[PDB]
């Protein structure tokens, strides 16, 4: 519909020609979200002295879910409206720490979840990207 | 709207097996893992080394998905999207054979990929589904 | 219901016992789609001089989206009804060319998008498969 | 066939697969759908047999092998590969290292092995 | 002959092969992990839920220590190593692995090649190292 | 004593190791990439968006030229190479890599093994090669 898609001010510009979130009837589809900042630096991938990124799954996961919360808030929803989470790791050795952060945000009572490790995410510094579906009738 | 199914394996994290949203049901990625955290279809050999069996795991995964749906008054006939995550495409033909025991071309859309890893090294398949069932 | 699933005439036969597209209320779920033709050859994987397939992400991505359009058209919908795109690459070095083709078809007023590289797709010649969700009330 | 190169007392054998000179594969029989069914047991046995043939071409044999590097694609294939390996070598034989790689050069392959052998002239 | 050696007090090899094989003046050491004799793993202690928590620093240190023990059992030492091949599973582990490597070797020591493979033979491993050493009898 | 060499003017090794190590009559050359001395990369020019675009042909040619330089610094040349181990990251790069390889080497020259690994030590890389050469003093 006319204003179904939203680019959210203050968030990182999407990697391609697509919005952060798309409404469809009562549903909201949130594009895969990373810890990347608007200046194209990465939360939780601070380079060390040699310039080598040191990815931190705890820091990136917390920032990804925080970013998703901001996106939902821009279209009148919040984390309590999320009904499906798809989480893409790059290494399952990051699972325990990612799971610990996930539990800071989602309770009983929360969305369905699926977690897999993919071969690569779109930037080599990423160790997590999450896409969600949310439900909130207008 | 959210459901923890009894006698199914306790979810890896703070999430239900299934979540209702309006007329829809979202089912979390499901494996052959039993409640006691052993796995159907990953029996250890004599050295203690698990031997994954894609046919056995796939059948148990879909059976488990059926059970989850049934706990909220739905069934496999209500499934509309299947996403399947293998770890090696050489397991495709067996997975494909078991899939056909449960679904046909009047059933759900299906997407199948091999991922780098599933959450337990014994696993060779996990499936998540979307189902449609107005109250 | 009885006519909710559709096998589309003129499209490649699905790899398993499933339809090209499935309606659920106002939504349409489109099965993961490749550049495979109805005759089981592939667009964008021409053999080189030794017979070794040479995958071409530009050509495959264009064919995949063209095919998704065909499937949607067969049930009275179109790319403008798409609301979520999930793209599966095998090599992130293919991302830039994939991204360029995606922009030929969709823009920021269109669907949410998620892109990851998987370990393997169902045929070794493939470098992209895409599944979509569309929204089109009857 | 994969090539062997002598260097002093040593023989370096190119990574060897179950592929034939005519580009067909031992141990990846296609189903009626045309999709290959890679078999680690058949491929491993053929690879080690192929390495034996290459070594015999230059006067050596598997008893002269001193290092084995094995490349799988799927560690779920390990147990069966391991059993075939034991048909040809034992603990008095070569050092061995086994990993799974992201890809081998052909999608039908589930094993490739490179070896170093020692056979002074 | 005496060319192949099974080193006492080390983890039993997972196939029918020795820890180290001599060939003329050379020693080939089989790929070595942090796995202990009792088949537990240094640097992959299970957490609260029983899930292994791999630690590249701890595993890398134990790997090179095991290789040192193996060489010392045949009268060689790390000063004799001439080629190191390191197999990670995740390049995000590189920096910590690299720092541990420097505890044992320097630029007067062996050539080194480091890659991340798809899988090692046990899922808890984040490093395995194969070496070639040179030690004339 | 003089068996290890850090080759002047080449990209600095990523860790505490030399470019090449002698062992008796053999030379072991560390895995080599297209990385320049200033730690930029040949064959991975960024596109408009600043995203690197790896080029297997350009990287492979630079890798072999670098290996030639390293061998020449210790008095050897490509003719002395007896084993080649090549690490790709995607087999769709294989044909082009092989074409460049054949510009330098006879196919019945050195023994060769080519696999695709999960990752190389820098994400811009699509090829790294390690060699063993034979050159008695
Ligand atoms: Mg058309
Ligand atoms: Mg024969």
Residue numbers in the entry:
A (entry chain A), C (entry chain C): 5 to 142
B (entry chain B): 8 to 142
D (entry chain E): 22 to 142
E (entry chain F), F (entry chain D): 6 to 142
Manuscript text:
The amnE gene product AmnE is a deaminase, and hydrolyzes 2-aminomuconate to 4-oxalocrotonate and releases ammonia in the modified meta-cleavage pathway. The deduced amino acid sequence of 2-aminomuconate deaminase in Pseudomonas sp. The metabolic pathway for 2-aminophenol in Pseudomonas sp. AP–3 is referred to as the modified meta-cleavage pathway, in which 2-aminomuconate is transformed into 4-oxalocrotonate by the deaminase AmnE. In this study, we demonstrate that AmnE self-assembles in a unique homo-hexameric form that is different from a regular trimer model of the RidA subfamily.
One of the AmnE hexamers is organized based on the use of two identical trimers, trimer I (A/B/C) and trimer II (D/E/F). Trimer III forms a hexamer with the use of trimer III in the neighboring asymmetric unit in the crystal lattice. The overall structure of the AmnE protomer shows an α + β fold with a β-sheet (β1 - β6), two α-helices (α1, α4), and two 310-helices (α2, α3), in an arrangement of β1 (residues 9 –10), β2 (residues 25–28), β3 (residues 31–37), α1 (residues 61 –78), α2 (residues 83–85), β4 (residues 86–93), β3 (residues 96–98), α4 (residues 99–106), β5 (residues 116–121), and β6 (residues 132–139). Lp2 (residues 38–60) is the longest loop and connects β3 and α1. Outside of the hexamer, six loops (Lp2A, Lp2B, and Lp2C, from trimer I, and Lp2D, Lp2E, and Lp2F, from trimer II) surround the hexamer and extend into the cleft area of the opposite trimer to form a solid football-like shape. There are six pivotal residues Arg56 (Arg56A–F) located on loops Lp2 (Lp2A–F) that formed eighteen hydrogen bonds in the hexamer with residues Pro126 (Pro126A–F) and Met96 (Met96A–F).
